[PDB]
């Protein structure tokens, strides 16, 4: 299943602690985003070194001794009719050439040492022709936590962004670096403070720096590990919304998904039939079906029932575009690639990122499409028509109309989805016929794995929202239950007390369990809302049946003593509840994280807390990876 | 004439102090920008008081009276059944709902704006704030203290307002700057300003919120920008014809009087102008006169087609500024009081889809722009292209260690390329919102967001190009510098190796003839071009008529003499720009900014000298060579 | 206002007889959709015939003695370096090289051929083109005469490849097939000989001035802006029958809303609005509606009619000011070299770009997007019995609903309709590549906007008229209710009376008669679980414990059973008599009357053989071929 590849990765991110660079040993997305994201991770170049010096000493011999090459004894790009002898200088000019970025806004620090990282694994294969000595400096900046500023914008996949790498390895002076998060000092006083001196490029070694596709591959990296981690989410989160939309959870039922079997749809189904085995959840969906059967929905809304066949595609393109990107990560993306064991040169294009590009394009499409499942969910959560219970936007009230609930964060999940499916176009249909008409198909793939990677901030949004919801379901949910339960009690003592037949006691006690109390709730004997018009109905069908001023008396004082009782008896349990079943569920993790570790509560006008307060804290541990603890507790004992 | 009224914006933008507001003057996307951008400009609200308290005493009286006003008295959005008479708590509770957004922020320029806007539409006397509420704006205003908001959230203004609103009544939870360099919850910054958290009365909170003023503030500055890089882009079309060795006939009046799209006429009518009396013209003329009938009849498309182009970019530019200032002077705000006539009368200002509309429509013509801006830099890169120009604008003389501006080259296709994918239209996207209440809504701060983005990206393109002109200027003077050399060592070498006439003619138009930049580079090399034709007539006057002797004497002491004395005016170097439209430009780039002709020899890199003209571009200093440029145009 | 422009349009479309072709009097967007559409209009080309001469024998003597001037002594585009002296060749050259379009047929209809052969002529008698007076003759007779080439759907950037096949057919090329009528196909040069013509041999200019204009971009941009104009007016006039039907508050409209946020879209749709319910007797039925429960009821309508006018205003904007730019490129001489005879030279620029209406096209594809997804809220509002205030689900008379889904159906096409809409409505114009060996690096490609931007229209034209056949539902299922509602209310009052109920019994019965929305109880009127025997039953109650015997309580048991006895009765028959009133009073009359009545339809149900299809497919002939139009003036009538 993908859900252990995911789970695998996850814990591949927390545990790694050295990433070993070596030519053969594979650099997945969990290792580049744990370089990017935690300080501890070190890079350890293993000395392939004999391999690299082999390529390199052809180079600068088969250079010197006037072998024609391109870019080591030829002109670059289109102007590769261009013969010289001048290697040093040929290589210094194309640096210059690209140093042509302009601060607007960069790129961010993770993804420039990712890059290094990308541009360093590269290397290792022995057919860059680089200095084994430059992939040292490499490392040793990578650990040094050293990395060029890079501007945002100008590659068409890396040119003008590895300009500045190699800037740096040269000492630039107009070539600013970062040390850590707040130092930054120009390329010559970075190299001295970690231990290094400025290179003087060597045949091909300007070329060998920037003629990869490290920047694209390195944003696709982190987008595909952020990918992964939150695809897992939504998936687990379906259940989460089964639980509380009181769903039917017969559409993960195994013979649906083996008669229509894409890989994505049978294995989100397993998932989800798993976390909803046993559910006390739905046990409680179960009960309130059997009450007025025939009066309630046979089947759950699309957002629900079609989430697998939905999920299907999305886990498909989500997994097979990381299998692209870990390629592209294992490549030498060079050119020329040196065969020096059949001493040629030979002239290709694995500078070439349309691979990566492309794979963002279909990826930005399936993170759209999480979205939009995100958003039919929360849709049909605020709307009290189609939530089997719960009241309109969350609302705890009792008084609702200064309590509007969770609308705001309604309003702002349909602005997320919008600026989502905006952003989920495509970029690879925008090449330009580029650098004097020589680059006529580029694969535009760091510009497409920019605009995925915004998509996935919002799709963070989302899910923090749809999280923080969700959790609001939980608490009203087991306060639904335990009003019922207060108002039955109140009745059938009542009943008892006013010497009312039994006939009339199991009407109204009927009345009781079958009316939702989140219609009610804000002023329990008011005789315009439903509790005292089922009653009242229910009271007139007994006399009928009975068919007296006896009983009209006695059903008279129930319903003064019912005034008189029942109101303070449901305040009582909901300022408790405010001061059960998802202790049995497998959502628990969530909850508990939701309320005990973060430290919230269930939201309502009492609570000072604003709904920001509460979404941000989720968001956090959602950006920075705490999100995964509870995930992978729910997930334990999973396959 | 556009160019009239854009030109009255700089000078707007430029020269205001005040913007007084007071319901009657207009407020226009200068002052807007002006006020964000300009720190010495204020807000002066002028006491249309009376109007206000009016409207004011009328919905507290009517709330009180437990009249039935939305918003009011009824819950908000899709509750709007639910009746209360909790009149300051409605309010409360709904400013509590949404300050619901999340940071992952609006900037501080983006904020001022919104509170300029929202101030604006209530002194329109429909809202029903208080007087006193206005005056804290223009406070907050003025003493630069604005709210942190959420960039995201809105569909178009209600969580984005609820941060100034949840500054004006003291959420500990809102944070404020304070100028720059300081960050404090609410009721320090309104303390720190001599105020008092405000006590929401009856629509108070419902009528800060209920605006379009995020959108329309995002909308205004990118309008702004929009005109003046318009006239920018339109201007430089000329600089490009002069450069490229245009010709100027594609701007003739005839020519657009024909289509007479008001966009094409009057973008035309500019280059026209401009290029009236080139010193640069002047060359391209004497360019085609040599051997005329192996050059173009015609310019290609991205200068000839320039004014067609231009037209519908302009008109929608142009268009959509009056949009985005209607909304600016607009009560976009619900309920509207109708005070005279005693009723709240309930619709839709809130709705912001005249903005976001026109949002989309000016993305598509910035990408017009853009593309435009492409289409030129690509031709001015490639020398089959750019009549007599070196490949990549590089100087060279060895072309095996300057790629020139390939760089730059580069750069462009990225812009173009994302700036295309930008002009989608976000206005498509329209999702059924807040329970099916919002079931139309117009996400015009999201499509304003986009249209800035895409405008950033046509600035980088913008100083690329200029840097790149600015450059081919260089290279076209020492091109003409060159020629004359090359003539004076083939005209006095042919005299003291004493040849005859014939063969002097000849030489001398193969001096004049071939493009100096395809043999710079090795002059007597035997193999470029100018040799290749010296050889060529040498045999030719050998045909039509010791000679030999001389010949080949003359070839010998171009080889010895030739180089040095080109290698000393370049050096030199290292004129007719000084008669062109376009020397405050040329002379803004390279004085003030303090840049010169690019090369192996010049250490600075591409990106400090474009970064130099950005830097220029995004602070507005680029309008001051743009208004001596444009000095006299009528 | 807009509605008075466009309805001066729909007067010259249906009233025009000859369009005359003259150098000065501007031809409209009615005028070519009036050629394209009614054969009975015949062109008059107006004998402007002297400049044409002067231009063409001023462009032949200049060419013969040797000038240089571009495309006629001179090659085409990038090689206009060549020169020669070769003048009939080089023209005949061009067109050869130019055919070179494949049929898919997909094709270029007869309708946008004939336009674009106008639009060609029209160009020339400005004079600035070369052209022979005798070739305009050939032109308006092939028009007259119904004679037009086959044309390739594409291959223009913008129209050289599109035109080369009217040029194809005047030089008589065997190749090019030829319409005559909508019967017959043959040769060009057979066609030519039907309509007493000998092919043309191609002086000097005459094969570029024949192809170098943006002809059949403006053609079918002519018939879209014509089309985006009626369209848009209907949609804006049937905003106001949709407030009708919705029970809406006609207070949206009000002109101070509006003065207030002046766009002139905003004020002039409201405006309209105002006027059209003005002394509504549908808006009495809406006042008295919110007069009833009015605490329980919703104090403002939903967005899709209360935001009505300010979602119109950039919508008529854009769809205006395009009709402006389109005109103007009918209007122009759109070709090059442009001859200023006059001044004796060729002024060479590029008037064949047809980028003013290729950015136009893209704006209108946006706005009418913008105009189906108006429809699409509103429609769904309509289906939906939670925002339809008291109309049945789906529209749904039933009775019995278990077997009447109503226009469910139409609701999920009218969701199809949208979302293929609004994917169209992404811009052509950003997908400029550099053609034509990089001489059209810039380019428009109107013609392939155009014709998105019609397809576009096609869908909003289904969309239209699934909303006009829902609200024609809409408006029987008012005023059955409101029928039903009086027998309801008569049934129990008399019964009341009969039963020897008190008076305060009775008024309170009486109230619910009144309150209660008839169709959630019409599937069975006397369901004790329904919402009228609900409302009975709780008021019986009530009474009882008001008057608090015996008497009472058999004389209310009495009521409840003969109620039950008598009622579904007189329901049945007011229904059955209504399938065998306000919209008399209604400015929507015309439309109601054109659809019921001439077009023979009926409500909707499971008794009328009729599918939807059947019903649909009449309301959108009528608007596809202009009879729609005909209730829209009678509509309109004194605005
Ligand atoms: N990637 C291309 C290039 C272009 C300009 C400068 C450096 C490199 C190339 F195709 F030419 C290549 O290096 O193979
Ligand atoms: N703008 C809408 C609204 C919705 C929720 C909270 C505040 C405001 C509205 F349509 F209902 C309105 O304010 O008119
Ligand atoms: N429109 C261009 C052209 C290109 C190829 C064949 C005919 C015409 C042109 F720009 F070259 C022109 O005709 O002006």
Same mark, same amino acid.
């Given at each position: 299943?993908?859900?252990?590849?995911?789970?695998?990765?996850?814990?591949?991110?927390?545990?790694?602690?050295?990433?070993?660079?070596?030519?053969?040993?594979?650099?997945?997305?969990?290792?580049?985003?744990?370089?990017?994201?935690?300080?501890?991770?070190?890079?350890?170049?293993?000395?392939?070194?004999?391999?690299?010096?082999?390529?390199?000493?052809?180079?600068?011999?088969?250079?010197?001794?006037?072998?024609?090459?391109?870019?080591?004894?030829?002109?670059?790009?289109?102007?590769?009719?261009?013969?010289?002898?001048?290697?040093?200088?040929?290589?210094?000019?194309?640096?210059?050439?690209?140093?042509?970025?302009?601060?607007?806004?960069?790129?961010?620090?993770?993804?420039?040492?990712?890059?290094?990282?990308?541009?360093?694994?590269?290397?290792?294969?022995?057919?860059?022709?680089?200095?084994?000595?430059?992939?040292?400096?490499?490392?040793?900046?990578?650990?040094?936590?050293?990395?060029?500023?890079?501007?945002?914008?100008?590659?068409?996949?890396?040119?003008?962004?590895?300009?500045?790498?190699?800037?740096?390895?040269?000492?630039?002076?107009?070539?600013?670096?970062?040390?850590?998060?707040?130092?930054?000092?120009?390329?010559?006083?970075?190299?001295?403070?970690?231990?290094?001196?400025?290179?003087?490029?060597?045949?091909?070694?300007?070329?060998?720096?920037?003629?990869?596709?490290?920047?694209?591959?390195?944003?696709?990296?982190?987008?595909?590990?952020?990918?992964?981690?939150?695809?897992?989410?939504?998936?687990?989160?379906?259940?989460?919304?089964?639980?509380?939309?009181?769903?039917?959870?017969?559409?993960?039922?195994?013979?649906?998904?083996?008669?229509?079997?894409?890989?994505?749809?049978?294995?989100?189904?397993?998932?989800?039939?798993?976390?909803?085995?046993?559910?006390?959840?739905?046990?409680?969906?179960?009960?309130?079906?059997?009450?007025?059967?025939?009066?309630?929905?046979?089947?759950?809304?699309?957002?629900?029932?079609?989430?697998?066949?939905?999920?299907?595609?999305?886990?498909?393109?989500?997994?097979?575009?990381?299998?692209?990107?870990?390629?592209?990560?294992?490549?030498?993306?060079?050119?020329?690639?040196?065969?020096?064991?059949?001493?040629?040169?030979?002239?290709?294009?694995?500078?070439?990122?349309?691979?990566?590009?492309?794979?963002?394009?279909?990826?930005?499409?399936?993170?759209?499409?999480?979205?939009?499942?995100?958003?039919?969910?929360?849709?049909?959560?605020?709307?009290?028509?189609?939530?089997?219970?719960?009241?309109?936007?969350?609302?705890?009230?009792?008084?609702?109309?200064?309590?509007?609930?969770?609308?705001?964060?309604?309003?702002?999940?349909?602005?997320?989805?919008?600026?989502?499916?905006?952003?989920?176009?495509?970029?690879?249909?925008?090449?330009?016929?580029?650098?004097?008409?020589?680059?006529?198909?580029?694969?535009?793939?760091?510009?497409?794995? !920019?605009?995925? *990677? $915004? /998509? @996935?901030?919002?799709?963070?949004?989302?899910?923090? %929202?749809? #999280?923080?919801?969700? +959790?609001?379901?939980?608490?009203? !949910?087991?306060? *639904? $239950? /335990? @009003?019922?339960?207060?108002?039955?009690?109140?009745? %059938?003592? #009542?009943?008892?007390? +006013?010497?009312?037949?039994?006939?009339?006691?199991?009407?109204?006690?009927?009345?009781?369990?079958?009316?939702?109390?989140?219609?009610? #709730?804000?002023?329990? +004997?008011?005789?315009?809302?439903?509790?005292?018009?089922?009653?009242?109905?229910?009271?007139?069908?007994?006399?009928?049946?009975?068919?007296?001023?006896?009983?009209?008396?006695?059903?008279?004082?129930?319903?003064?003593?019912?005034?008189?009782?029942?109101?303070?008896?449901?305040?009582?349990?909901?300022?408790?509840?405010?001061?059960?079943?998802?202790?049995?569920?497998?959502?628990?993790?969530?909850?508990?994280?939701?309320?005990?570790?973060?430290?919230?509560?269930?939201?309502?006008?009492?609570?000072?807390?604003?709904?920001?307060?509460?979404?941000?804290?989720?968001?956090?541990?959602?950006?920075?990876?705490?999100?995964?603890?509870?995930?992978?507790?729910?997930?334990?004992?999973?396959?």
């Amino acid at each position: 299943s993908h859900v252990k590849d995911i789970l695998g990765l996850i814990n591949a991110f927390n545990e790694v602690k050295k990433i070993t660079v070596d030519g053969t040993t594979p650099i997945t997305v969990a290792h580049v985003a744990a370089l990017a994201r935690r300080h501890d991770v070190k890079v350890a170049l293993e000395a392939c070194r004999a391999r690299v010096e082999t390529c390199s000493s052809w180079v600068q011999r088969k250079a010197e001794d006037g072998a024609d090459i391109y870019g080591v004894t030829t002109g670059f790009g289109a102007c590769s009719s261009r013969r010289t002898n001048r290697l040093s200088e040929l290589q210094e000019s194309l640096i210059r050439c690209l140093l042509a970025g302009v601060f607007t806004d960069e790129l961010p620090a993770t993804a420039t040492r990712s890059a290094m990282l990308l541009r360093l694994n590269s290397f290792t294969y022995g057919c860059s022709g680089i200095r084994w000595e430059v992939m040292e400096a490499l490392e040793k900046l990578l650990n040094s936590n050293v990395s060029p500023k890079v501007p945002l914008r100008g590659s068409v996949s890396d040119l003008i962004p590895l300009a500045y790498i190699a800037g740096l390895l040269i000492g630039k002076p107009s070539v600013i670096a970062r040390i850590g998060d707040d130092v930054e000092v120009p390329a010559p006083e970075a190299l001295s403070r970690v231990g290094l001196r400025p290179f003087k490029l060597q045949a091909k070694e300007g070329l060998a720096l920037v003629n990869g596709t490290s920047f694209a591959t390195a944003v696709a990296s982190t987008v595909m590990y952020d990918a992964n981690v939150l695809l897992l989410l939504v998936e687990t989160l379906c259940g989460m919304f089964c639980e509380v939309i009181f769903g039917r959870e017969e559409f993960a039922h195994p013979l649906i998904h083996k008669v229509k079997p894409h890989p994505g749809q049978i294995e989100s189904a397993e998932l989800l039939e798993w976390l909803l085995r046993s559910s006390p959840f739905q046990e409680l969906s179960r009960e309130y079906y059997s009450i007025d059967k025939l009066k309630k929905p046979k089947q759950d809304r699309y957002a629900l029932r079609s989430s697998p066949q939905w999920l299907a595609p999305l886990v498909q393109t989500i997994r097979d575009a990381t299998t692209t990107v870990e390629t592209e990560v294992n490549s030498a993306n060079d050119n020329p690639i040196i065969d020096h064991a059949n001493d040629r040169a030979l002239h290709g294009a694995n500078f070439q990122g349309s691979a990566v590009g492309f794979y963002m394009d279909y990826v930005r499409i399936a993170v759209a499409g999480l979205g939009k499942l995100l958003f039919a969910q929360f849709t049909e959560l605020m709307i009290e028509y189609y939530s089997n219970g719960l009241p309109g936007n969350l609302s705890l009230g009792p008084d609702l109309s200064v309590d509007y609930g969770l609308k705001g964060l309604d309003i702002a999940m349909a602005a997320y989805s919008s600026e989502l499916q905006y952003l989920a176009n495509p970029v690879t249909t925008h090449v330009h016929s580029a650098e004097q008409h020589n680059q006529d198909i580029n694969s535009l793939a760091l510009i497409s794995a !920019r605009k995925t *990677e $915004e /998509a @996935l901030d919002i799709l963070k949004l989302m899910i923090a %929202s749809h #999280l923080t919801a969700m +959790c609001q379901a939980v608490d009203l !949910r087991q306060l *639904e $239950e /335990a @009003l019922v339960k207060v108002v039955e009690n109140v009745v %059938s003592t #009542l009943a008892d007390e +006013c010497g009312l037949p039994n006939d009339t006691k199991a009407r109204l006690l009927y009345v009781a369990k079958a009316v939702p109390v989140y219609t009610y #709730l804000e002023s329990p +004997c008011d005789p315009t809302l439903p509790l005292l018009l089922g009653l009242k109905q229910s009271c007139f069908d007994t006399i009928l049946a009975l068919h007296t001023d006896t009983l009209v008396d006695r059903l008279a004082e129930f319903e003064k003593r019912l005034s008189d009782r029942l109101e303070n008896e449901m305040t009582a349990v909901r300022v408790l509840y405010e001061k059960v079943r998802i202790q049995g569920s497998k959502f628990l993790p969530f909850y508990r994280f939701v309320r005990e570790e973060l430290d919230t509560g269930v939201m309502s006008a009492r609570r000072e807390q604003t709904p920001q307060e509460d979404v941000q804290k989720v968001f956090d541990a959602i950006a920075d990876g705490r999100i995964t603890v509870p995930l992978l507790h729910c997930l334990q004992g999973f396959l």
